[PDB]
Design a protein around this ligand. Sequence first.
Ligand code: SF4
Ligand code: SF4
Ligand code: SF4
Lengths: 153, 318, 121, 178, 122, 37, 177, 103, 78, 24, 101, 382
Amino acid sequence: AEFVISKVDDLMNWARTGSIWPMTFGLACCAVEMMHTGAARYDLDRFGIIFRPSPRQSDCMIVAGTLTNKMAPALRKVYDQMPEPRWVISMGSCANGGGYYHYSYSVVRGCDRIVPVDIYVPGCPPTAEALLYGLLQLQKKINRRKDFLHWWN
Amino acid sequence: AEILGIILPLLLGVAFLVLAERKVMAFVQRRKGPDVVGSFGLLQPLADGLKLILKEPISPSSANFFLFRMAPVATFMLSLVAWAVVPFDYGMVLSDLNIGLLYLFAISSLGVYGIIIAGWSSNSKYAFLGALRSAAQMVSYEVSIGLILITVLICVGSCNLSEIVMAQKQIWFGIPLFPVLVMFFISCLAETNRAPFDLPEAEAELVAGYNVEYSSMGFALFFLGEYANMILMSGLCTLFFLGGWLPILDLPIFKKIPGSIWFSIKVLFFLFLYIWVRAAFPRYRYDQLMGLGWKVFLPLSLAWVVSVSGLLVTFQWL
Amino acid sequence: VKQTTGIVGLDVVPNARAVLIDLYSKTLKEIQAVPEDEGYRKAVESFTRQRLNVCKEEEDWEMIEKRLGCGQVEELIEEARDELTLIGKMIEWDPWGVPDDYECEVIENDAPIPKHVPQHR
Amino acid sequence: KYSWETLPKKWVKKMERSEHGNRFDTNTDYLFQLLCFLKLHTYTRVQVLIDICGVDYPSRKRRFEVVYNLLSTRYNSRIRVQTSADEVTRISSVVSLFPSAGWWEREVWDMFGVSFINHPDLRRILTDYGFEGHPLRKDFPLSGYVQVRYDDPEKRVVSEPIEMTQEFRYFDFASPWE
Amino acid sequence: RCLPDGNLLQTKIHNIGATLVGVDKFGNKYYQKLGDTQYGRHRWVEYASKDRYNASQVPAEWHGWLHFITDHTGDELLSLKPKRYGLEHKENFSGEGDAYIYHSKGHTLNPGQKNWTRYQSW
Amino acid sequence: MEKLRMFVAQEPVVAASCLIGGVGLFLPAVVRPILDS
Amino acid sequence: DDEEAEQLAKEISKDWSTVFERSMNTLFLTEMVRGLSLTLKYFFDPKVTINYPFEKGPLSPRFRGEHALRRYPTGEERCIACKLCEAVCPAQAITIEAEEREDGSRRTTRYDIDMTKCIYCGFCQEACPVDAIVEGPNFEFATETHEELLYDKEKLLENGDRWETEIAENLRSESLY
Amino acid sequence: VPPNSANLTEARRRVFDFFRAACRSIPTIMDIYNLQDVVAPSQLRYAISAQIRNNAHITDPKVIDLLIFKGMEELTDIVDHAKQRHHIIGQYDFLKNFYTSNY
Amino acid sequence: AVVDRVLDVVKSFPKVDPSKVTPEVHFQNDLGLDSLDTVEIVMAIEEEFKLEIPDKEADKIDSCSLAIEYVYNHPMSS
Amino acid sequence: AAAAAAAAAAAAAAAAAAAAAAAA
Amino acid sequence: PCAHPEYLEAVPKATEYRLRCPATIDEEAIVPSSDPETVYNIVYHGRDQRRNRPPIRRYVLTKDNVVQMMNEKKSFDVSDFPKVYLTTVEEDLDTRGGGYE
Amino acid sequence: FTLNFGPQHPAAHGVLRLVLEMNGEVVERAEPHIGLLHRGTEKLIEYKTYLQALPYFDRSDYVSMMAQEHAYSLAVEKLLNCEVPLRAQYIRVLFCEITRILNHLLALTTHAMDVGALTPFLWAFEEREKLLEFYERVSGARMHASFIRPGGVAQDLPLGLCRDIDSFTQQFASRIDELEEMLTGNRIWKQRLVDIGTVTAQQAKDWGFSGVMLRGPGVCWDLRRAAPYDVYDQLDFDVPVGTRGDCYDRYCIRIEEMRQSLRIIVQCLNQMPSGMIKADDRKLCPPSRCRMKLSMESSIHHFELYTEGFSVPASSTYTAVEAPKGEFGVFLVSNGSNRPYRCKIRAPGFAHLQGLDFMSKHHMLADVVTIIGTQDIVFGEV
Ligand code: SF4
Ligand code: SF4
Ligand code: SF4
């Protein structure tokens, strides 16, 4: 019946939620907090998250820090070369929304102006666990995909 | 045929070596590695795989399909065909070649082609020069591995790998020629890239250093190739120097002495040594690296062929 | 006998005293080209005379340092050569003499500074 | 202070302070010449251009005030030579004396607009590439003129349209009686 | 158990020596394994929803004890939660359908989209 | 010799290769003719 | 000079049984085996890691996380609309509009903190006179969509009633400072 | 570059210098950003001349110096791939207002 | 040869009138053009005839006749 | 290339503090 | 055979550390605000720091003043010169306290 | 031959956008591109009060947070003449020094992860997640602890923080030793660092390095010995000063400066006077919550200090402390009003990253990441 489709979606989502390697656009301190979320205490290699250093092979892109109006084209160019089942996480106030620099001329009012965002880690310096919970919310966003059921319409 | 029984288990070995490296190199860094996906990350390799398989391409580009869509196939086929002659236990080699060792040398000399071609088909000057540098490194620590194998060959009678592991019943060549094992390991580290010797594999310069059209299959096949080449070049430091499938020969009452299990234990030791030595040491910069394969591991390899030839000719130990 | 100046780049000079005497004589000779009633010439003359004197009296570089308390003789040579550059530069674009108007505003404030702020020692 | 006695009186032209760090508010013409002094001088050895702080006083006639800080690692003292150059007065550049002045003067020109004479590679360092306008002035609004950047049908491109945002709320905290 | 598919196995490899200190309303069992070793790993929570669990399911009565900010188990702060305005937790339904997710008062998804025009039209 | 020690310090691997190799070019040179007994 | 510096730095280690020490510590890589040994000691030692969702990192009652508008024990939002936090806010996240309610006591018709435009510096918690706005130790409120992340006027910041049991604890323990 | 503009004459001389520079650089502009098909060299010369003429009524020499400097900045950031190309193609009565807004 | 094409490029110029253009026409006297337009016409000359016209000489062409006597004398004429 | 190669020889490690160890 | 001279025995894993969790008020802190002498004596203009400062004395120097000063400065005798910040380097391994601070 | 060498490992050096003009593998010039992290900090501070201005400073250098709040505080006390207590000074140093440790623990092992050593990164980051248990405990936020306010310091330490900082300092000599035994002895390290980015002292002075890159070259210049700006004139510590200037000296300094900072932490712990936490001048320091609620005159100041501000008198000072990156100084012109006026932030990394051009000339392309390593280039300050 549909049960086979439900289980193949569960399987695809388990894959894409188990191994989700983000191109960590670590601009600024939220990259230092992201480095703590990649560090020994809160493992991100535990949840499968492997910080890729290249946009070419990466399921996610944890943009962190102040997206400057000059690093906006570079972020967009990097986001355009991720393989289609990609997601973006905004980490820190400066990356998710205007932030401390909302009214700065050189700061875009949140990466939601350049890349379409799927989970905004909240808190200007998010606790390393908070970025980790943002990623555990991206995992939920994967677990709600069911792409096969939609391919069968 | 029974080539499935040596490629499929090797595919599983490579897939679980990505996890073994992440997990061991993580334990080193005081952190559990992949630990949520499976019971202990045991399903994490399948997750990485099934993810890379389900990732839509960035551009289809199936037109250029004979140039660089069979070059990773070539690299991987070579890394897998050098496993025929590798004997896991007495009479468990798939094809006992009486010139087995030289055949491994030739397989490496063709892996050079694999790298060069798969780098030239990437129309990226930086990536192509990186692939050429990686090939020159893999081939400059091949004269040193060549001479190290000439040492372990002088000790043995013939190139037959089953004989080289049968010639160690008295003592493993790791005990007398330990300085040579250190040079074969530090060369197998450098022949393959995964090492303190991986500037072409500096985290970023690797991905942008093998191809432009990834499609995921290329990324997985290169890493599956690097990890099989690693299982192989660790299955050579354990045939030649460690006793291929030989116990310590104490003949315990608790131990019924299986052969392939001993070969497995030793290749696990050398894989764990690959990981440990990736964790604990800085990279060599490829400009001190090439000046270590010529100025350090070639003189110290030539000396060893003259030392293990002399000391075995004077006293008739040959 | 000096092994090395701790500073990098300031190479130890064996003939420290001799080149110091040379540089200070050059400085005394070259400073004559600036008007006498300028604070710069009084300063140059005075300290160059003091250092040339103490360099002629003492023999070792260590005694030059000990009496002329100005660091190391290599840094002293750097200072003397930079001073020669400045005197040969000051000859050009001569800034001497006060102009006719010369509106100079000594905005000499004296706010008390808390001292848990840096200032200097 | 010793530095004021030896210094040619004309070089410290306009002002001179005596606390909160001492300063020689000089004239733009005698600036690099004044920076040549205080460096390559035996009793005043600065050698270290710490900072070049553009300061914009809109109510002056010489709007900007290029505040050259200077540390003297030898004598352990810090002098702040200043200048005054309006929007269209090219001021002497001291990258020839202290080569650290290169980027600081690029930033002073970028933020303010005080072009520097014979400064090699005087190019906007901080602001965006196609940036028109000088931010750290006073009359430059905080949110910028045309500085929103969003993606659009001009794919792979972020446009630079006129700006619109939640209005920056300026709070008039300043109280009477100072 | 029966979950070899999660890091929940790491928690169930804990609890071997741990003592159970209370259990909140939702079922989350709050454990403590002190004395043995590894400070920072001596207070956790077993979410009682072995699948579909996530952080923020830990109520405020325990979210103090469990982050080591306090030493008051939720069975002790439950005598301090205010009765008049006290509200149960909400699990942070972020994305799980509208009317569970939060919405501002103009989002056009919020029932009763208010109009902000300060002038009252005629 | 002073320069010999300067060479076995600056370049240990070409001075301990011309000595892990001497023991191989020296054993069959003299130690083998010695083994006439 | 570098030539003479090399000659002398190699004539410092030039006495037999010191050239030998350095040769056996650059041939039998010995500096490196002390690296491998330490790395092994750490491979076998317990791991400083935290299986996150089940146990979380240590915090403090001063921890600044999700902003919550407190209430007085007897209902009645504590937030009299002084606008001090709207003033002190560095990022100007809080937008406060005030209206004399029918009861007569001032209250905020609009108290919207924009969490995305917010630096979580705790200035609002300090500036508020009655402790009306405090940061709840939540810090776990990652939202799928940006509009949810803008915390509405006194309705979602009114979810601090759930966090009051922990916020009241943190305040009762921090008020000594 | 020192402001040798002690008079409008030197400033105008270097204006013509910058104009010759931009004109003789139009080849690389058309090449790097691919306008040799959409725009004609006559049209780019027309636009550069309309720029230099739109700001021709500057009786101040230093303001002309600074204008030429901004122009050289724009050019040098157009010659090299510092700025993109979709702006270079763009760089090249009362009632009808009343109907739209109040301003 | 060169005269015909310099005439054509002065004619087709987007800031002139083809009537007053003549082998004797002057940029300021009979064409009524600005010095910037003169330098632009000189740029047109050196891009149509591929010549590398120095500015010190380019300043001195004020009439089409001088344009002729300077486009002819170029040994590198194109 | 005649570029100055990074010679990995140097003087031996000797921790060099400032002169203010005991009495400034 | 490594960096363990009975001193790495101070290991990173603490296991008894922050034994009193922060929000547990075993002892109620006091954190004095003002010195005891300044509780019931709130006279401020004496204690003031913002505004209790001498005013800025900006007086002009004309040519006469500076030529007078240049003529008054007869000679630059020593002690009319800025003192050098003397700092030399000196090798020391662990002698300060014996490695124990 | 131009190469657009960008961020090799993102999340470590975020917006690094060098444009290297190479010669084969030998770099002929390195042209760094700035502005990719140019938030409007030197403009946004002109628009906010002296209190609202402080949070920008912990966001100026993101790996050494409180050092910049300490450099700003000392620039709004240089004007205010705001004498802070002894306990405020000792806490302020015990956290400026914990910040020196938090920075060298990152700027060493992030550098050592760019070079290739993967494990020192994670050991040092466990150490940093121990020190953020102090930041997060004393103020609230693990990274941006807007804690060193102008008058004194935000609020007193919790009643168990010195015991925990002690239990950390006892076990921190061993962590430095491990970071040292893993990197100092290695021949793969020395080779990767010795004679890399050598800066003769005249160059480190010219280019205004003034940091751990001015004590590599051998210039004994620490603004805690030169311009003691706190209890530093009471605290004993030796400033390690290099003798060659190569990136192996700057590493050895940053790994000794991480021990002298341990000495300073242990001293600040052992001698921390039980005094008031903020300056008694309640027109520069908002009164406590308890006082402003009970006292009407304190409530007025809590209102005019969290809305109006100080209105520090009209002046202009350059207060420079020894931040871990280097001499971080904030030139703070102050119009009489309550908002600063061109709060210019001299940040090392703007002067250091200038040095990349001449430091990495004729070094191989793989060295250009080692130079960026030892400069401690954090682009928030650039
Ligand atoms: S949002 Fe806050 S923590 Fe994140 S990068 Fe911006 S200032 Fe740093
Ligand atoms: S912490 Fe409070 S005052 Fe500071 S920006 Fe956020 S909401 Fe505003
Ligand atoms: S939250 Fe505090 S500062 Fe803001 S309006 Fe309410 S009482 Fe006033």
